[PDB]
Write a protein that binds this DNA or RNA. Structure first.
Ligand SMILES: [Ca+2]
Ligand SMILES: [Mg+2]
Ligand code: NA
Lengths: 51, 231
RNA sequence: GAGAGCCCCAGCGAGAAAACGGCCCCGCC
């Protein structure tokens, strides 16, 4: 589960009902796949800046 | 920072610099949001009064995207102890909100259990600041990759008490460490290209000394308190 | 874990030349 490659989550992984549940820091939205985290704005937390 | 490398454009956008009456940097900070900065409690005893600079890479030339924010409130941990630097943490709320832009962006607060299992267990973290380049303040923002050091080795290495609010990172004899002027700044841990707050530069028995390590405020112990201080 | 006693309280309250105990976070029978 979460100990197998972070449950395939981009960010936070935890277990509930014997299943992986992925989540994301503030300023991200969990993707439709339930795993990837999508920035809601141009300067999401934890990303080095490119412009 | 002793050793390490310069932060290249956009590489350390969460670095804050605490500046005194003379516009001289004396501590770092970590940008957490538009209004909030994480720093070390002991940095509040270093100047009579101060402000916070964001977006700086080269202090020697005030040239473009820098901005200076006044502090609205200081939220020091009630349990900070000067004698030990136990509970070495504070949050600053700024009077005006930071505009995120190139070189200005928050570091992520992780969830505690996941931070423990997944961040603190990584090989290294990243520390940054404008502090001294040997045990002589850097004009340029520097960063350094610091291996996590296990608690037993940390305590055995130290002549002063290492509390559960502290952790070791850095190297035994290799000449790389945080130093004076870096205190209060970011220790972040990278996970899939996203950088999460894991520490606050706290103290060291000198800088980069043989048999010694960098001592950091263990942010996991304070995530609930940080949330209190930011609500 | 849980009660309780004290300590702490540069955040929300209240008060009296702007580090000066009701509540959130937190410390030591
Ligand atoms: Ca500059
Ligand atoms: Mg008081
Ligand atoms: Na060392």
């Amino acid at each position: 589960l979460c100990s197998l490659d972070n449950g395939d989550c981009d960010q936070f992984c935890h277990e509930e009902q014997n299943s992986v549940v992925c989540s994301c820091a503030r300023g991200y939205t969990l993707a439709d796949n339930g795993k990837a985290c999508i920035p809601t704005g141009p300067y999401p937390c934890g990303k080095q800046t490119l412009e | 920072i002793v050793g390490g490398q310069e932060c290249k454009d956009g590489e350390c956008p969460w670095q804050a610099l605490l500046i005194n009456e003379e516009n001289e940097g004396f501590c770092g900070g970590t940008i957490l949001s538009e209004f909030y900065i994480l720093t070390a409690a002991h940095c509040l005893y270093q100047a009579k009064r101060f402000k916070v600079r964001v977006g700086d890479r080269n202090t020697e030339q005030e040239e473009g995207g820098e901005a200076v924010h006044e502090v609205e409130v200081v939220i020091k941990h009630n349990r900070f102890t000067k004698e030990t630097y136990d509970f070495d943490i504070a949050v600053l709320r700024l009077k005006t909100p930071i505009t995120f832009r190139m070189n200005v962006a928050p570091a992520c607060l992780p969830e505690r259990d996941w931070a423990e299992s997944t961040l603190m267990t990584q090989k290294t973290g990243i520390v940054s600041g404008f502090g001294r380049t040997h045990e002589r303040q850097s004009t340029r923002l520097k960063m350094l990759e610091v291996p996590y050091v296990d608690r037993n080795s940390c305590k055995l290495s130290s002549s002063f008490i290492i509390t559960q609010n502290m952790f070791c990172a850095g190297y035994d004899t290799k000449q790389e460490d945080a130093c004076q002027g870096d205190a209060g700044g970011p220790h972040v841990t990278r996970f899939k290209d996203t950088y999460f707050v894991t520490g606050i530069v706290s103290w060291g028995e000198g800088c980069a000394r043989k048999g010694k390590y960098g001592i950091y405020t263990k942010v996991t112990a304070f995530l609930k308190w940080i949330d209190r201080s930011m609500k």
